mmCIF file of all heavy atoms in Angstrom:
data_model
loop_
_atom_site.group_PDB
_atom_site.id
_atom_site.type_symbol
_atom_site.label_atom_id
_atom_site.label_comp_id
_atom_site.label_asym_id
_atom_site.label_seq_id
_atom_site.Cartn_x
_atom_site.Cartn_y
_atom_site.Cartn_z
ATOM 1 N N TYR V 1 -42.279 -0.193 -22.771
ATOM 2 C CA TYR V 1 -42.553 -0.768 -24.081
ATOM 3 C C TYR V 1 -43.067 0.332 -24.996
ATOM 4 O O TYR V 1 -43.946 1.110 -24.607
ATOM 5 C CB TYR V 1 -43.577 -1.902 -23.983
ATOM 6 C CG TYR V 1 -43.674 -2.754 -25.231
ATOM 7 C CD1 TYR V 1 -43.159 -4.042 -25.257
ATOM 8 C CD2 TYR V 1 -44.283 -2.269 -26.382
ATOM 9 C CE1 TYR V 1 -43.247 -4.824 -26.394
ATOM 10 C CE2 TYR V 1 -44.374 -3.043 -27.524
ATOM 11 C CZ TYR V 1 -43.854 -4.320 -27.524
ATOM 12 O OH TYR V 1 -43.942 -5.094 -28.657
ATOM 13 N N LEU V 2 -42.522 0.396 -26.206
ATOM 14 C CA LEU V 2 -42.847 1.447 -27.155
ATOM 15 C C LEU V 2 -43.548 0.859 -28.374
ATOM 16 O O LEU V 2 -43.257 -0.262 -28.800
ATOM 17 C CB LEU V 2 -41.584 2.196 -27.584
ATOM 18 C CG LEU V 2 -40.896 2.968 -26.455
ATOM 19 C CD1 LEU V 2 -39.638 2.242 -25.997
ATOM 20 C CD2 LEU V 2 -40.575 4.395 -26.874
ATOM 21 N N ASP V 3 -44.478 1.633 -28.930
ATOM 22 C CA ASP V 3 -45.289 1.189 -30.064
ATOM 23 C C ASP V 3 -44.544 1.423 -31.379
ATOM 24 O O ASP V 3 -44.972 2.174 -32.255
ATOM 25 C CB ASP V 3 -46.636 1.902 -30.057
ATOM 26 C CG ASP V 3 -47.580 1.374 -31.120
ATOM 27 O OD1 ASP V 3 -47.641 0.141 -31.303
ATOM 28 O OD2 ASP V 3 -48.260 2.194 -31.771
ATOM 29 N N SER V 4 -43.399 0.757 -31.502
ATOM 30 C CA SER V 4 -42.576 0.834 -32.701
ATOM 31 C C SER V 4 -42.906 -0.255 -33.713
ATOM 32 O O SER V 4 -42.245 -0.335 -34.754
ATOM 33 C CB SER V 4 -41.092 0.752 -32.327
ATOM 34 O OG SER V 4 -40.881 -0.184 -31.284
ATOM 35 N N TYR V 5 -43.903 -1.091 -33.434
ATOM 36 C CA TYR V 5 -44.316 -2.162 -34.330
ATOM 37 C C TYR V 5 -45.811 -2.042 -34.580
ATOM 38 O O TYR V 5 -46.589 -1.873 -33.636
ATOM 39 C CB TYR V 5 -43.983 -3.535 -33.737
ATOM 40 C CG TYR V 5 -42.728 -3.546 -32.894
ATOM 41 C CD1 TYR V 5 -42.778 -3.858 -31.542
ATOM 42 C CD2 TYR V 5 -41.492 -3.240 -33.449
ATOM 43 C CE1 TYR V 5 -41.634 -3.868 -30.767
ATOM 44 C CE2 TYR V 5 -40.342 -3.247 -32.682
ATOM 45 C CZ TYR V 5 -40.419 -3.562 -31.342
ATOM 46 O OH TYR V 5 -39.277 -3.570 -30.574
ATOM 47 N N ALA V 6 -46.210 -2.129 -35.851
ATOM 48 C CA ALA V 6 -47.628 -2.033 -36.181
ATOM 49 C C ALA V 6 -48.414 -3.175 -35.550
ATOM 50 O O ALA V 6 -49.526 -2.971 -35.048
ATOM 51 C CB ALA V 6 -47.818 -2.024 -37.698
ATOM 52 N N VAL V 7 -47.855 -4.382 -35.566
ATOM 53 C CA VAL V 7 -48.473 -5.558 -34.963
ATOM 54 C C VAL V 7 -47.657 -5.944 -33.738
ATOM 55 O O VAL V 7 -46.438 -6.134 -33.828
ATOM 56 C CB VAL V 7 -48.556 -6.727 -35.960
ATOM 57 C CG1 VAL V 7 -49.283 -7.909 -35.334
ATOM 58 C CG2 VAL V 7 -49.247 -6.286 -37.242
ATOM 59 N N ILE V 8 -48.331 -6.060 -32.593
ATOM 60 C CA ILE V 8 -47.644 -6.377 -31.349
ATOM 61 C C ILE V 8 -47.099 -7.800 -31.406
ATOM 62 O O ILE V 8 -47.668 -8.688 -32.055
ATOM 63 C CB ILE V 8 -48.593 -6.192 -30.150
ATOM 64 C CG1 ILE V 8 -48.981 -4.718 -30.002
ATOM 65 C CG2 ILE V 8 -47.944 -6.692 -28.868
ATOM 66 C CD1 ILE V 8 -50.282 -4.504 -29.259
ATOM 67 N N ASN V 9 -45.979 -8.021 -30.715
ATOM 68 C CA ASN V 9 -45.349 -9.338 -30.640
ATOM 69 C C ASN V 9 -45.021 -9.875 -32.032
ATOM 70 O O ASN V 9 -45.219 -11.056 -32.325
ATOM 71 C CB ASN V 9 -46.231 -10.325 -29.873
ATOM 72 C CG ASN V 9 -46.410 -9.936 -28.418
ATOM 73 O OD1 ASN V 9 -45.889 -8.917 -27.967
ATOM 74 N ND2 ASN V 9 -47.150 -10.751 -27.675
ATOM 75 N N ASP V 10 -44.517 -9.000 -32.898
ATOM 76 C CA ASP V 10 -44.121 -9.394 -34.248
ATOM 77 C C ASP V 10 -42.929 -8.538 -34.651
ATOM 78 O O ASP V 10 -43.073 -7.330 -34.860
ATOM 79 C CB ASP V 10 -45.277 -9.232 -35.230
ATOM 80 C CG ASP V 10 -45.011 -9.908 -36.561
ATOM 81 O OD1 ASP V 10 -44.313 -9.311 -37.407
ATOM 82 O OD2 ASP V 10 -45.501 -11.040 -36.762
ATOM 83 N N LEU V 11 -41.755 -9.164 -34.759
ATOM 84 C CA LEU V 11 -40.531 -8.437 -35.073
ATOM 85 C C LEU V 11 -40.423 -8.062 -36.544
ATOM 86 O O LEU V 11 -39.658 -7.152 -36.882
ATOM 87 C CB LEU V 11 -39.312 -9.271 -34.673
ATOM 88 C CG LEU V 11 -39.296 -9.784 -33.231
ATOM 89 C CD1 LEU V 11 -38.170 -10.787 -33.033
ATOM 90 C CD2 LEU V 11 -39.168 -8.630 -32.249
ATOM 91 N N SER V 12 -41.166 -8.735 -37.424
ATOM 92 C CA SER V 12 -41.067 -8.472 -38.855
ATOM 93 C C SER V 12 -41.739 -7.169 -39.268
ATOM 94 O O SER V 12 -41.592 -6.761 -40.425
ATOM 95 C CB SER V 12 -41.680 -9.633 -39.641
ATOM 96 O OG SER V 12 -40.825 -10.763 -39.631
ATOM 97 N N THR V 13 -42.464 -6.511 -38.363
ATOM 98 C CA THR V 13 -43.204 -5.294 -38.675
ATOM 99 C C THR V 13 -42.592 -4.066 -38.008
ATOM 100 O O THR V 13 -43.313 -3.174 -37.554
ATOM 101 C CB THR V 13 -44.669 -5.435 -38.263
ATOM 102 O OG1 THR V 13 -45.300 -4.150 -38.285
ATOM 103 C CG2 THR V 13 -44.783 -6.020 -36.865
ATOM 104 N N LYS V 14 -41.264 -4.008 -37.936
ATOM 105 C CA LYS V 14 -40.600 -2.852 -37.348
ATOM 106 C C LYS V 14 -40.954 -1.591 -38.124
ATOM 107 O O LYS V 14 -40.906 -1.570 -39.358
ATOM 108 C CB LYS V 14 -39.087 -3.064 -37.337
ATOM 109 C CG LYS V 14 -38.585 -3.877 -36.155
ATOM 110 C CD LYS V 14 -37.136 -4.294 -36.340
ATOM 111 C CE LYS V 14 -36.694 -5.265 -35.257
ATOM 112 N NZ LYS V 14 -35.265 -5.657 -35.407
ATOM 113 N N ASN V 15 -41.310 -0.538 -37.397
ATOM 114 C CA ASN V 15 -41.700 0.724 -38.006
ATOM 115 C C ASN V 15 -40.477 1.598 -38.266
ATOM 116 O O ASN V 15 -39.395 1.382 -37.714
ATOM 117 C CB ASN V 15 -42.692 1.470 -37.113
ATOM 118 C CG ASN V 15 -43.979 0.697 -36.899
ATOM 119 O OD1 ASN V 15 -44.259 -0.272 -37.605
ATOM 120 N ND2 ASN V 15 -44.768 1.122 -35.920
ATOM 121 N N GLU V 16 -40.667 2.599 -39.123
ATOM 122 C CA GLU V 16 -39.625 3.562 -39.475
ATOM 123 C C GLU V 16 -39.851 4.906 -38.797
ATOM 124 O O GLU V 16 -39.608 5.962 -39.389
ATOM 125 C CB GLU V 16 -39.553 3.730 -40.989
ATOM 126 C CG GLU V 16 -39.074 2.490 -41.727
ATOM 127 C CD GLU V 16 -39.019 2.689 -43.229
ATOM 128 O OE1 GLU V 16 -39.523 3.725 -43.711
ATOM 129 O OE2 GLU V 16 -38.472 1.810 -43.928
ATOM 130 N N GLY V 17 -40.322 4.894 -37.552
ATOM 131 C CA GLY V 17 -40.597 6.141 -36.864
ATOM 132 C C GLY V 17 -39.341 6.966 -36.664
ATOM 133 O O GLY V 17 -38.224 6.447 -36.622
ATOM 134 N N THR V 18 -39.535 8.280 -36.539
ATOM 135 C CA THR V 18 -38.433 9.226 -36.404
ATOM 136 C C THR V 18 -38.193 9.612 -34.947
ATOM 137 O O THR V 18 -37.089 9.431 -34.425
ATOM 138 C CB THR V 18 -38.718 10.477 -37.246
ATOM 139 O OG1 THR V 18 -39.216 10.088 -38.533
ATOM 140 C CG2 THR V 18 -37.454 11.302 -37.427
ATOM 141 N N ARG V 19 -39.216 10.145 -34.277
ATOM 142 C CA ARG V 19 -39.078 10.508 -32.871
ATOM 143 C C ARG V 19 -39.094 9.276 -31.976
ATOM 144 O O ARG V 19 -38.392 9.232 -30.959
ATOM 145 C CB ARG V 19 -40.201 11.465 -32.461
ATOM 146 C CG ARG V 19 -40.525 12.548 -33.483
ATOM 147 C CD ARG V 19 -39.301 13.376 -33.836
ATOM 148 N NE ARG V 19 -38.737 14.030 -32.660
ATOM 149 C CZ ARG V 19 -37.443 14.106 -32.377
ATOM 150 N NH1 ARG V 19 -36.523 13.590 -33.177
ATOM 151 N NH2 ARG V 19 -37.059 14.721 -31.262
ATOM 152 N N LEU V 20 -39.892 8.272 -32.342
ATOM 153 C CA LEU V 20 -40.078 7.112 -31.478
ATOM 154 C C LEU V 20 -38.776 6.341 -31.293
ATOM 155 O O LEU V 20 -38.438 5.938 -30.174
ATOM 156 C CB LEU V 20 -41.162 6.208 -32.066
ATOM 157 C CG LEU V 20 -41.323 4.781 -31.533
ATOM 158 C CD1 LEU V 20 -41.151 4.671 -30.022
ATOM 159 C CD2 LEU V 20 -42.678 4.236 -31.948
ATOM 160 N N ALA V 21 -38.036 6.116 -32.381
ATOM 161 C CA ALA V 21 -36.791 5.362 -32.277
ATOM 162 C C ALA V 21 -35.784 6.085 -31.394
ATOM 163 O O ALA V 21 -35.137 5.467 -30.540
ATOM 164 C CB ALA V 21 -36.208 5.121 -33.669
ATOM 165 N N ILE V 22 -35.642 7.398 -31.579
ATOM 166 C CA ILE V 22 -34.691 8.160 -30.778
ATOM 167 C C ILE V 22 -35.106 8.155 -29.313
ATOM 168 O O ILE V 22 -34.263 8.048 -28.415
ATOM 169 C CB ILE V 22 -34.558 9.592 -31.329
ATOM 170 C CG1 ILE V 22 -33.497 9.631 -32.431
ATOM 171 C CG2 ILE V 22 -34.216 10.579 -30.213
ATOM 172 C CD1 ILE V 22 -32.071 9.692 -31.918
ATOM 173 N N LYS V 23 -36.406 8.294 -29.042
ATOM 174 C CA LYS V 23 -36.863 8.287 -27.657
ATOM 175 C C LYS V 23 -36.615 6.936 -27.002
ATOM 176 O O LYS V 23 -36.187 6.869 -25.846
ATOM 177 C CB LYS V 23 -38.344 8.659 -27.586
ATOM 178 C CG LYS V 23 -38.657 10.133 -27.279
ATOM 179 C CD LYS V 23 -38.014 10.667 -25.992
ATOM 180 C CE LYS V 23 -36.676 11.378 -26.222
ATOM 181 N NZ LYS V 23 -36.175 12.016 -24.975
ATOM 182 N N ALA V 24 -36.872 5.843 -27.726
ATOM 183 C CA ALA V 24 -36.575 4.520 -27.186
ATOM 184 C C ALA V 24 -35.084 4.366 -26.917
ATOM 185 O O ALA V 24 -34.682 3.819 -25.881
ATOM 186 C CB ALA V 24 -37.058 3.438 -28.150
ATOM 187 N N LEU V 25 -34.249 4.840 -27.842
ATOM 188 C CA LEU V 25 -32.806 4.743 -27.662
ATOM 189 C C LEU V 25 -32.355 5.507 -26.424
ATOM 190 O O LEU V 25 -31.569 4.999 -25.618
ATOM 191 C CB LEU V 25 -32.098 5.269 -28.911
ATOM 192 C CG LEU V 25 -30.669 4.797 -29.189
ATOM 193 C CD1 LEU V 25 -30.524 3.294 -29.060
ATOM 194 C CD2 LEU V 25 -30.247 5.247 -30.578
ATOM 195 N N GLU V 26 -32.853 6.733 -26.252
ATOM 196 C CA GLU V 26 -32.477 7.523 -25.083
ATOM 197 C C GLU V 26 -32.975 6.871 -23.800
ATOM 198 O O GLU V 26 -32.262 6.842 -22.788
ATOM 199 C CB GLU V 26 -33.018 8.949 -25.227
ATOM 200 C CG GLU V 26 -33.199 9.723 -23.919
ATOM 201 C CD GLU V 26 -34.481 9.368 -23.182
ATOM 202 O OE1 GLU V 26 -35.323 8.647 -23.758
ATOM 203 O OE2 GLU V 26 -34.644 9.809 -22.026
ATOM 204 N N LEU V 27 -34.201 6.343 -23.819
ATOM 205 C CA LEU V 27 -34.751 5.705 -22.630
ATOM 206 C C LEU V 27 -33.915 4.499 -22.226
ATOM 207 O O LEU V 27 -33.620 4.307 -21.040
ATOM 208 C CB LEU V 27 -36.203 5.299 -22.892
ATOM 209 C CG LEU V 27 -37.138 5.015 -21.711
ATOM 210 C CD1 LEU V 27 -36.830 5.887 -20.500
ATOM 211 C CD2 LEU V 27 -38.584 5.203 -22.147
ATOM 212 N N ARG V 28 -33.511 3.680 -23.199
ATOM 213 C CA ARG V 28 -32.651 2.544 -22.888
ATOM 214 C C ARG V 28 -31.263 3.003 -22.456
ATOM 215 O O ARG V 28 -30.616 2.334 -21.643
ATOM 216 C CB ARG V 28 -32.565 1.609 -24.095
ATOM 217 C CG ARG V 28 -31.511 0.514 -23.980
ATOM 218 C CD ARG V 28 -30.297 0.818 -24.836
ATOM 219 N NE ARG V 28 -30.627 0.867 -26.256
ATOM 220 C CZ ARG V 28 -30.633 -0.183 -27.066
ATOM 221 N NH1 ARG V 28 -30.327 -1.395 -26.632
ATOM 222 N NH2 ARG V 28 -30.954 -0.013 -28.345
#
């Protein structure tokens, strides 16, 4: 689980991270 959301368990708060999104994509 990656901290790509400011508020946990809330899809409306998706973050615009740069490294985090790519790392999550590679991990998946």
Side-chain angles (χ1 to χ4, degrees):
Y1 193 107
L2 295 105
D3 186 42
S4 39
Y5 327 118
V7 184
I8 295 157
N9 295 1
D10 193 279
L11 307 170
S12 285
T13 167
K14 277 168 188 181
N15 298 346
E16 293 180 350
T18 316
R19 318 304 301 137
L20 166 40
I22 273 279
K23 263 305 95 173
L25 203 48
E26 157 280 351
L27 199 33
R28 170 255 297 272

